[PDB]
Amino acid sequence: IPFAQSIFYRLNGVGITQQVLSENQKIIANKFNQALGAMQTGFTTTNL
Amino acid sequence: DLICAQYVAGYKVLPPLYDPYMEAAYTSSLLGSIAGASWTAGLSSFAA
Amino acid sequence: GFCGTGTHIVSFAINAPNGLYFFHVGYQPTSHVNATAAYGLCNTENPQKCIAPIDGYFVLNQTTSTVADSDQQWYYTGSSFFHPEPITEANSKYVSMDVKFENLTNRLPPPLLSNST
Amino acid sequence: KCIAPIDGYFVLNQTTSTVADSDQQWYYTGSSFFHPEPITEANSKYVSM
Ligand SMILES: *[C@@H]1O[C@H](CO)[C@@H](O[C@@H]2O[C@H](CO)[C@@H](O)[C@H](O)[C@H]2NC(C)=O)[C@H](O)[C@H]1NC(C)=O
Ligand SMILES: *[C@@H]1O[C@H](CO)[C@@H](O[C@@H]2O[C@H](CO)[C@@H](O)[C@H](O)[C@H]2NC(C)=O)[C@H](O)[C@H]1NC(C)=O
Numbered sequence: 001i002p003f004a005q006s007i008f009y010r011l012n013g014v015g016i017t018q019q020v021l022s023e024n025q026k027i028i029a030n031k032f033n034q035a036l037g038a039m040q041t042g043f044t045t046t047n048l
Numbered sequence: 049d050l051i052c053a054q055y056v057a058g059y060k061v062l063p064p065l066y067d068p069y070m071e072a073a074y075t076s077s078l079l080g081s082i083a084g085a086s087w088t089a090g091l092s093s094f095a096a
Numbered sequence: 097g098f099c100g101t102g103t104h105i106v107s108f109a110i111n112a113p114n115g116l117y118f119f120h121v122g123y124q125p126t127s128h129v130n131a132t133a134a135y136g137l138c139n140t141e142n143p144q145k146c147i148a149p150i151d152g153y154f155v156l157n158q159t160t161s162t163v164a165d166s167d168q169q170w171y172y173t174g175s176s177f178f179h180p181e182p183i184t185e186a187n188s189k190y191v192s193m194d195v196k197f198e199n200l201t202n203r204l205p206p207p208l209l210s211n212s213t
Numbered sequence: 214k215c216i217a218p219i220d221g222y223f224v225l226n227q228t229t230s231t232v233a234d235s236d237q238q239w240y241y242t243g244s245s246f247f248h249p250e251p252i253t254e255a256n257s258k259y260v261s262m
């Protein structure tokens with residue numbers, strides 16, 4: 001099964017129903033995308 | 049005698065990081081934790 | 097606690113000098129709502145049938161301050177996002193009778209109705 | 214109404230190259246050994262759409 005479809009099965013497994021996941025595909029994808037863009041600002045001496 | 053030997057041998061016993069009032073707050077929060085209901089998946093709801 | 101903090105969704109691993117470096121993407125809620133829940137629902141017939149949720153809660157759609165016991169309809173919600181939806185047999189088990197369960201007279205879910213035509 | 218498998222898959226019994234959408238019957242199989250069998254309520258949940 002593709003990567004995009006197996007992420008939505010991991011969000012359905014923690015308690016988000018299929019009617020929330022279908023109405024908020026783009027918002028969930030945007031929030032996932034701007035968390036991988038923030039990994040490359042965590043290579044500093046404050047990051048333990 | 050090994051408490052008063054810090055000042056004749058040349059070592060020091062350092063105080064702990066937290067006082068006994070902080071670790072009495074750690075075990076009081078362990079006694080009354082909510083931990084939402086035990087038929088649900090996830091760790092993000094809190095059922096009192 | 098194992099794969100980070102919160103509810104674990106996914107993890108990635110990259111190479112680092114002398115080892116591996118993990119990124120644990122988890123789920124973090126940023127607001128909440130205080131919903132009135134129930135342990136379960138039962139009808140008022142003999143023999144009594146009773147239901148319970150599956151990975152979620154039986155809640156009240158708290159909108160106004162006038163709905164009470166003749167319009168107190170119960171909905172189902174997932175445990176990680178508040179969005180009430182109708183109670184069907186896709187999200188409720190049958191259980192043995194408890195005392196903490198609500199006794200319902202009208203507005204029954206379809207699991208609690210007379211299935212015989 | 215919608216259903217989903219229980220510890221297995223909803224598969225097609227791939228035998229010929231003529232069965233398509235009027236004879237595409239779906240069977241159930243266990244996840245560790247391929248052996249198609251009919252779909253009853255012993256191997257399927259009801260789910261939301
Ligand atoms: C639960 O209550 C909410 C209101 O708080 C209902 O949401 C409304 O739905 C109608 C029709 O879809 C919309 O026109 C309104 O704008 C919605 N309200 C808000 C605040 O967004 C919801 O329908 C109720 N749930 C059920 C299952 O009846
Ligand atoms: C629903 O009705 C039943 C009646 O069968 C209630 O069960 C009684 O509960 C009281 C205390 O709440 C006990 O003293 C009785 O012994 C129970 N009766 C039986 C036959 O076990 C139940 O409490 C009601 N639920 C609610 C929420 O009112």
Ligand SMILES: *[C@@H]1O[C@H](CO)[C@@H](O[C@@H]2O[C@H](CO)[C@@H](O)[C@H](O)[C@H]2NC(C)=O)[C@H](O)[C@H]1NC(C)=O
Nearest residue numbers: 225226227228229238239240241248249250251
């Ligand atoms: C799925 O297809 C297979 C054929 O690939 C069917 O197996 C046949 O069953 C009949 C009757 O039991 C036998 O005479 C054949 O020899 C079988 N074929 C083979 C290749 O062994 C099987 O019955 C089908 N499954 C279902 C549920 O209809």
